[PDB]
Amino acid sequence: LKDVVTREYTINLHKRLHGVSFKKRAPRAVKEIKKFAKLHMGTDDVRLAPELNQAIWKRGVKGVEYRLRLRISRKRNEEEDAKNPLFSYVEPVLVASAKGLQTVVVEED
Amino acid sequence: ANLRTQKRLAASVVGVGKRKVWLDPNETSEIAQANSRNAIRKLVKNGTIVKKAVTVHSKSRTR
Amino acid sequence: GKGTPSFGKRHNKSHTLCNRCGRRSFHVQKKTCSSCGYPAAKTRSYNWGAKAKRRHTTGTGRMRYLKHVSRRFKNGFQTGSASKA
Amino acid sequence: AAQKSFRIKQKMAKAKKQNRPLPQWIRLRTNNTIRYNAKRRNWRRTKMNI
RNA sequence: AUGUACAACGGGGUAUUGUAAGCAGUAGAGUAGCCUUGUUGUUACGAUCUGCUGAGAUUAAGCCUUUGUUGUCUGAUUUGU
RNA sequence: UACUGAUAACCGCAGCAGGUCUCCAAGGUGAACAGCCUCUAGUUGAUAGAAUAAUGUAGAUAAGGGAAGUCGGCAAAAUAG
RNA sequence: UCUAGUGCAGAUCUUGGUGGUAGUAGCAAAUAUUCAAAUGAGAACUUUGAAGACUGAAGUGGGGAAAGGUUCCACGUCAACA
RNA sequence: GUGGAGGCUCGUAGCGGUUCUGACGUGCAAAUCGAUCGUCGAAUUUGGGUAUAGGGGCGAAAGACUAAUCGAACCAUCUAGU
RNA sequence: GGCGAGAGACCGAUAGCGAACAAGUACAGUGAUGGAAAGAUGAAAAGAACUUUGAAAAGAGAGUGAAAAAGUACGUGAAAUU
Numbered sequence: 001l002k003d004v005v006t007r008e009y010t011i012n013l014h015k016r017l018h019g020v021s022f023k024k025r026a027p028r029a030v031k032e033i034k035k036f037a038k039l040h041m042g043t044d045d046v047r048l049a050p051e052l053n054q055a056i057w058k059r060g061v062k063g064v065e066y067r068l069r070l071r072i073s074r075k076r077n078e079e080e081d082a083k084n085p086l087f088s089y090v091e092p093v094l095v096a097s098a099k100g101l102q103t104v105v106v107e108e109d
Numbered sequence: 110a111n112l113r114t115q116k117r118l119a120a121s122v123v124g125v126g127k128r129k130v131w132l133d134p135n136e137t138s139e140i141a142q143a144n145s146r147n148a149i150r151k152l153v154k155n156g157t158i159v160k161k162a163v164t165v166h167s168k169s170r171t172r
Numbered sequence: 173g174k175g176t177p178s179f180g181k182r183h184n185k186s187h188t189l190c191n192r193c194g195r196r197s198f199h200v201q202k203k204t205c206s207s208c209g210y211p212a213a214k215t216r217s218y219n220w221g222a223k224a225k226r227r228h229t230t231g232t233g234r235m236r237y238l239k240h241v242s243r244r245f246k247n248g249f250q251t252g253s254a255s256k257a
Numbered sequence: 258a259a260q261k262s263f264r265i266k267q268k269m270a271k272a273k274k275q276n277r278p279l280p281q282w283i284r285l286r287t288n289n290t291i292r293y294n295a296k297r298r299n300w301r302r303t304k305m306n307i
Numbered sequence: 308a309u310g311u312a313c314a315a316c317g318g319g320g321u322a323u324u325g326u327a328a329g330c331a332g333u334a335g336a337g338u339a340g341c342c343u344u345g346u347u348g349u350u351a352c353g354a355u356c357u358g359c360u361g362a363g364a365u366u367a368a369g370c371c372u373u374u375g376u377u378g379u380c381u382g383a384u385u386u387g388u
Numbered sequence: 389u390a391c392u393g394a395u396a397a398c399c400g401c402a403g404c405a406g407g408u409c410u411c412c413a414a415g416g417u418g419a420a421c422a423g424c425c426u427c428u429a430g431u432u433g434a435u436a437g438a439a440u441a442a443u444g445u446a447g448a449u450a451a452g453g454g455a456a457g458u459c460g461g462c463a464a465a466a467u468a469g
Numbered sequence: 470u471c472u473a474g475u476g477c478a479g480a481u482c483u484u485g486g487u488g489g490u491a492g493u494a495g496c497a498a499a500u501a502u503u504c505a506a507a508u509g510a511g512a513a514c515u516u517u518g519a520a521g522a523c524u525g526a527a528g529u530g531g532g533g534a535a536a537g538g539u540u541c542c543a544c545g546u547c548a549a550c551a
Numbered sequence: 552g553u554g555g556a557g558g559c560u561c562g563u564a565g566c567g568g569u570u571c572u573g574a575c576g577u578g579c580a581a582a583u584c585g586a587u588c589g590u591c592g593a594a595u596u597u598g599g600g601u602a603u604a605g606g607g608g609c610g611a612a613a614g615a616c617u618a619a620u621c622g623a624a625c626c627a628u629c630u631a632g633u
Numbered sequence: 634g635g636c637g638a639g640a641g642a643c644c645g646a647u648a649g650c651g652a653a654c655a656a657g658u659a660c661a662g663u664g665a666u667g668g669a670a671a672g673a674u675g676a677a678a679a680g681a682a683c684u685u686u687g688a689a690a691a692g693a694g695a696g697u698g699a700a701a702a703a704g705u706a707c708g709u710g711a712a713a714u715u
Contacts (some may be wrong), residue, residue, distance in 0.1 A: 008377095010316055011316085012367090024502090026521080027501095030503065040314095040315070042379080050504045050505050050519055052360075052504075053520065056504090058366085058520085058521090060521065061502080075539070093542090101316080102316055102317045102376045103315075103376070111508090112517070114542085126427095131517095132517060134516090134517045135518095136507065137506095137516085137517065138507095163428085166414095167483085171417095174579075174619060175580095176406055176583085177582095178400090180399050180408055182408090183408070187664060189264060189307060189402085195664095196306055197664060199664080201600090205408060216626090218628085219628085220627050221627065222627090223651090223657080223666080234650050242636055258534075258537075259390085259391090260534080262518095266475095273538085279639095295658090300537070300538055301402095304537075304538090306663095
């Protein structure tokens, strides 16, 4: 309903990928990020930025980073209204080192 | 849309391969209108298609 | 590998078309058709190949002259032309 | 093949002119018993044997 | 279904490995060059070494813990002596 | 006189891991058109998703012993330039 | 009254058709796919772009012989095939 | 020292096909897949053309091969053979 | 056998010529040779205007027709099986 918000989060791909085949680590990272956004925003429609896909596939398939710093943007929908008026846009935050950060809220500016 | 043959004509025109030719999606309607090598040449001229930055193989380590 | 791979090795025609029958039976290294007997004068037939005769005999074609033969016998092999009654 | 003979090419041309469907006005004519072509020939399925 | 609530993060603990990067050094096999000619003369190369450094990284995915941060907590179905 | 020349245009009942003559042939390692990596060129095709029980197939490791196993040291291991 | 190619449960019968098995076995070789956009009624696979990978010049490259025959190229187009 | 022979040898392609009596075994396949193996400059491998035809051929000989067919091919007929 | 005529205590579309139909056809095989299946709307296409749902195919209505329990998957329309 409400909450056209943005926020910044941190995610532990290591514990979400532990035990996983080396040809599926990165794809599972993608699916797990969609699941993360579903949890934290209750949305089903989740669009990931190609910047984020590259930041995941940077070190390859089986070199995915332990942690990631995300900028999620719960937004209103358009375009021949779907099941949900709201979706999520997942984007990266180019940080030098993504350790020691806690999550925050972010506004329109 | 479908731009296979456009990419192919461009490859042959410029003298590179399809793994080099670049077609911007934001002019897709124009490139699909384009059917002939003359039009492909016009498109390269106006920059809607670029040859490509060659992939590097360096020899510093070997030297 | 007497089967499948040898069928893969199989690509050179023993037989090609014949100019008397048009059936792809002309053995090149013998220079004979296996159906009509080309380049012999006679046509190849056998009375054990009854079906073959029936397949290659008179009436399976146009009979470009022979139908008119019986018409003409009926009219008595006449010369000339009509008279505009 | 590429290096071919004129007889082969002749038969091929004839085949190519055969390989197309019926005319629908023939489907329309009187006393017609034809619905479809059945001498139809496709390079993938059956070969000419020439 | 609004609480010694739950989660995601963060922090701390416990563990594993083995002393991170970067900077500096009158450490360094030796070798070139300099001129102020040396009275360690200095500049450049150079495996590696030493200090900052039992440091740094990883640490729950089926580890412990939380005075922190940010969120979430009324959708559907069925049932009767 | 186009085009394929083959894990889809040929033959194998087929869009079959089979078979079918040949020419050109970069850099590095290395003795080497060996194996590994890369450039030009080309592909990214083979039904997919979620779990990760037994059993399988393929691949690996295992203290101490060291062929006692077994028809038989089969297989694997060691050896290796 | 006459006359027969005259009566089927079978013949591993013939031809055609239909089932249970069973929505089952199974669709697993060839290292591997992902993000977004466009189209479209509809996209795991079509097209583009970006990324990650492979063949690694005795190659999944480029050209041919035999064979094949128009598969070549384009436009439309998805009932059947893939 | 030179030189660089060999039906020499190691070992690629290539030709083959030992063992696992492995996989598969209503398969990828009416003989394949993977590893392990043999040989690899010669009695080598091989395309095309050509000759040899059924009680006949060809055979570095297994009764092997002769169009998925061989201790005598395939087609039709004799033949509705007994 | 060929050409032309007439007839039947014959067969009646798994029968009768292999062939009642675009049958010695498609198709297979190197080749010799082999060798199918397949008839019927209705008297007459009058073969379904028009509306609506749907992306469309099709559906529901409408309507033609003596009959859609005749809708080119068309005479009737058995059984297995559903």
